[PDB]
Amino acid sequence: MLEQPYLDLAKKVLDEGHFKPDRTHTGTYSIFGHQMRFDLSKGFPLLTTKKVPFGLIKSELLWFLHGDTNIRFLLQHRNHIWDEWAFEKWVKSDEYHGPDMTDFGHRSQKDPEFAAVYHEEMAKFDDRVLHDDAFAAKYGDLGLVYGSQWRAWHTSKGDTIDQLGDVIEQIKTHPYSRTLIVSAWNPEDVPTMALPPCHTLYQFYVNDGKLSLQLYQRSADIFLGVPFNIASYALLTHLVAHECGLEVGEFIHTFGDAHLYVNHLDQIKEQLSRTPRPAPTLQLNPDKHDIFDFDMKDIKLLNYDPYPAIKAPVAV
Amino acid sequence: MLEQPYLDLAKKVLDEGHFKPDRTHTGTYSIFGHQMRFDLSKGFPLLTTKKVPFGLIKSELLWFLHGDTNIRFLLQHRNHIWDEWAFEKWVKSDEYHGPDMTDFGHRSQKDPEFAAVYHEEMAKFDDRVLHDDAFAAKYGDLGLVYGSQWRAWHTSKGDTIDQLGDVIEQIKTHPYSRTLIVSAWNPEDVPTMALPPCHTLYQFYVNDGKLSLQLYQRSADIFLGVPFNIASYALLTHLVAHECGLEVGEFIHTFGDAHLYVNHLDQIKEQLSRTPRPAPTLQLNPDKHDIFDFDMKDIKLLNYDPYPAIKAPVAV
């Protein structure tokens, strides 16, 4: 079926990947260099062998597309995917007044009573960011995340570049261009960053009136990360094609270090028991075309009929 | 044999690539997204099915490694691979005094008597760059080429970053790092550039005491470009491993738009008739280890036993 490459990637790292230690200190089985391709005319690559929350991938892409870098927009959509980053910053500050929260990441997965005190501090932070404008302005702003890298690359001349906006203009006037690239990797920021981007860069390609996109992901969590990643960029490929009056081609996913954290083996093994169901269909608002002013309601996913979700521990 | 992936890439674009128009206006048969991998413990991937001048790949890599951006070093090594770029600049200037040379690229391949007047202007330019210090300083300096992108990335704070030097330090102290990346793509320069880099970025990977490298090439000329490209980065993988006291792993070559210009079909077809000979062996100076102070003599290629070279027209 449509998602078979993903299952094949998991099987391969399972019986071919070598043990490799990592940053988090949760071992991994890793492979270097892999490539999968999805034919988007065959359907949307949202995995049917595990329930994946499209709502979260949709509102995160829109946040990127608006060149927004403030958690506030996400929280308003019940999307807590980036809270940890903002929170960290709040916690590690002069204005912070409460429990140490030091290394709140592991401590929650280890201490039961801490997971409730931390879960509280965070619960308040999210409300303050939502309601206190000066707060959101100071702690809700991540600064260097995909939204600004894509739409506001800061130049040495002090200005700001809209790579994505520019490339889309280039797809419209020079379809056969071999330089339709958007990068998220800035050598001057990366060495200080908390999370240097995993989605390093992407390239568009146009031929026979069909738009294709290739993504270079430097590091990937096969079980938890990849199911989301495939959907974000397959969606992005669709949006850009809608605006450019193009048909959709393939989404090619290239990998640097593709890995399976050692505490996800039982879960990935179980998923491999399931049998892929037909793939859902993506439907976009035909009346609206300016994808930067697109909103949650402009994108619908039809026929997603997944298997139950599989819980697994976040590699801390 | 060791080079089979290259021959397989050519066959595939031959009977699977679709016709796609390009910048040069010399049609191409193109594919988007491909990946080949070379096991460097099996030998050096210098093609045996066509004679490829390793001397030119060796002195071009060293020029990059020194963070040099002046043609002068190359000319001194009888390497004219970049003259066109410097020359263009000389020709299109106030100080230039001679024949129009306008569009010297096609005009040489079309006009016989022009190919000798242009061939002359260039012949002088190369000598002036070689002997006139102030000239070399002004016209021999390309500015933004791999040497400065790798070793002198200009920051917005006015400084200069040595990505390559820094990453090598990171390979030594954090082998299992998933951020060992060197980028050549700067969003602020690229939109003005003559040749935005083809070799967008590369990533190192270390496991089981072996160093691997993956390259993302956005555009590739399968017949003329790729044979060189494979060798430059396979060599780079060896040099870095030598310095880091690591063994050599694989060189993974990833492609955006891989293409065959329409006027190279007869040549590529002929090469496909040849039968790969065993691969040469690379030998580096065991006494010297600082690869930035490496010189032509520190690197030897043993047993290269190729087929005759195949001439083909440079797509102008």
From Swiss-Prot, chains A, B:
Q: Quick one: a GO cellular component term?
A: cytosol
What's its EC? 2.1.1.45
| Active-site residues per Swiss-Prot or TrEMBL entry | 198
Which positions does UniProt annotate for (6R)-5,10-methylene-5,6,7,8-tetrahydrofolate binding? Answer: 221, 315
**Pfam families in the record, alphabetically?**
Thymidylat_synt
Cross-referenced SUPFAM superfamilies, in alphabetical order?
Thymidylate synthase/dCMP hydroxymethylase (SSF55831)
Its annotated pathway reads: Pyrimidine metabolism; dTTP biosynthesis
In this chain, dUMP is annotated as bound at 23, 178-179, 218-221, 229, 259-261
Q: Where in the cell is it found?
A: Cytoplasm
Under catalytic activity, the entry for this protein gives:
dUMP + (6R)-5,10-methylene-5,6,7,8-tetrahydrofolate = 7,8-dihydrofolate + dTMP
Q: Which UniProt keywords apply?
A: Cytoplasm, Methyltransferase, Nucleotide biosynthesis, Transferase
MF terms in GO = thymidylate synthase activity
Top-rank taxon = Bacteria
Q: Name one GO biological process term.
A: dTMP biosynthetic process
Judged by the first EC level, this protein's enzyme class is: transferase
Per the similarity annotation, which family is this?
Answer: Belongs to the thymidylate synthase family. Bacterial-type ThyA subfamily.
Q: Which HAMAP family match?
A: Thymidy_synth_bact
What functional role does this protein have?
Answer: Catalyzes the reductive methylation of 2'-deoxyuridine-5'-monophosphate (dUMP) to 2'-deoxythymidine-5'-monophosphate (dTMP) while utilizing 5,10-methylenetetrahydrofolate (mTHF) as the methyl donor and reductant in the reaction, yielding dihydrofolate (DHF) as a by-product. This enzymatic reaction provides an intracellular de novo source of dTMP, an essential precursor for DNA biosynthesis.
Q: How does it assemble?
A: Homodimer.
Q: Please report the name of this protein according to its UniProt entry.
A: Thymidylate synthase
